[PDB]
């Protein structure tokens, strides 16, 4: 059935909750992002309405066929009232359209629920900072301090820096990106970007790029292969056998891969340095694993939540173990200690 921390107390509203049939008394269904895990259920047969970004209306419609009279995008930034509750939309910093979201109850108790995102100090300075959040929704998936990681502008520099270097070296080197959702787009722009390509992928992926309101990106992708020198392929093919075979595709115009896996954290981060990050190597075949994240690490979450002071903290993420469950619920406490909230 559907889980407390999808509901939002005094409404008949629910967040990514399209899984569990009709929910009793929901009135409006809210979508934060398109990621699998979240939209799963819905389809051309759905008939509540759904409230969303304009790209995850895009999404929604071109990819789902979700049909149109039930995708009620909102702009971002914007005061804007459904079902006679003040609702706002800000910038999550996750994947492209995604959102959190705001609540101003009927009562006078305000509720943020974050979606998926990535915490930034920017976020201080949003409509956020003008009024007092009582009830936190939280995206706690690397809710431990393990989980460090570096910024995005860092790894994006390894990766340009990386690339341009191994193709100058051998213009018969062909670069490989991973992708499995939306999301990460930086990483294979930025790289085709330094090595004055476009990217190349398949006819459904393309589709998918074009839903997301990138500028230019009539420039910067194709369907061409051929004509093209970054592919994007699906991240079950980034391993030795998937990438051979991918070579052997691309008839003698290559001899070298270089790919990345730009993974979410992976144990090396608690030893290694980004500078200090190497490849598996398997004959003219190599397989880098980068750190970059959409989601807040440990120290960024952390910030965020002792800026906001919420009275009450509910998790999203990690919450089917009670282990993890008293864990989290051990560092809020620690946190809100620590601030004096
Ligand atoms: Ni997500």
């Known amino acids: 059935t559907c889980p407390f921390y999808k509901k939002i107390p005094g409404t008949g509203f629910t967040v ?12 409006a269904y809210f979508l934060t992002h398109f990621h699998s895990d979240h939209y799963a259920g819905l389809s051309k047969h759905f008939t509540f309405p759904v409230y969303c970004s304009e790209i995850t209306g ?27 509750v003040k609702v706002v939309l800000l910038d999550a910093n996750h994947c ?28 201080e300075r949003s409509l956020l900072a003008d009024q007092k959040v009582h009830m936190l929704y939280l995206d706690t998936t690397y809710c431990s301090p393990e ?3 570096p910024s995005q502008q860092e790894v994006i520099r390894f990766a340009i820096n990386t690339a341009f270097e191994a193709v100058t070296l051998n213009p018969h080197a062909l670069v490989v990106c991973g992708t499995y959702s939306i999301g990460k787009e930086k990483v294979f722009l930025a790289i085709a970007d330094v090595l004055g390509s476009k990217v190349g992928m398949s006819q459904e992926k393309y589709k998918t790029l074009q839903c997301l309101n990138i500028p230019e990106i009539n420039s910067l992708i194709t369907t061409d292969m051929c ?23 691309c008839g003698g115009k290559y001899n070298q891969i270089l790919a990345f896996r730009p993974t979410g954290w992976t144990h090396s981060n608690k030893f290694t340095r980004i500078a200090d990050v190497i490849p598996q190597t398997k004959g003219n075949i190599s397989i880098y694993g980068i750190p970059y994240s959409e989601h807040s690490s440990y120290l960024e979450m952390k910030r965020f939540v002792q800026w906001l002071k919420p009275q009450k903290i509910i998790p999203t993420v990690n919450v089917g173990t009670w282990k993890s469950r008293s864990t989290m619920e051990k560092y809020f406490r620690e946190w809100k200690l620590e601030a004096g909230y």
């Open 16 to 27: 990514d909750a399209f899984q569990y049939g009709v929910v009793e008394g929901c009135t």
């Open 58 to 84: 895009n999404l929604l419609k071109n990819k789902l066929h979700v049909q149109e009279q039930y995708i009620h995008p909102l702009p971002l930034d914007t005061e804007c009232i459904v079902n006679g």
């Open 96 to 123: 492209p359209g995604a959102v959190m979201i705001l609540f101003y109850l009927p009562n006078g108790t305000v509720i943020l629920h974050t979606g998926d995102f990535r915490a930034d100090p920017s976020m």
């Open 147 to 149: 989980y460090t990681f």
């Open 227 to 249: 004509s093209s020198l970054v592919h994007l392929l699906p991240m079950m093919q980034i391993n030795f056998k998937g990438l051979q075979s991918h070579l052997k595709k």
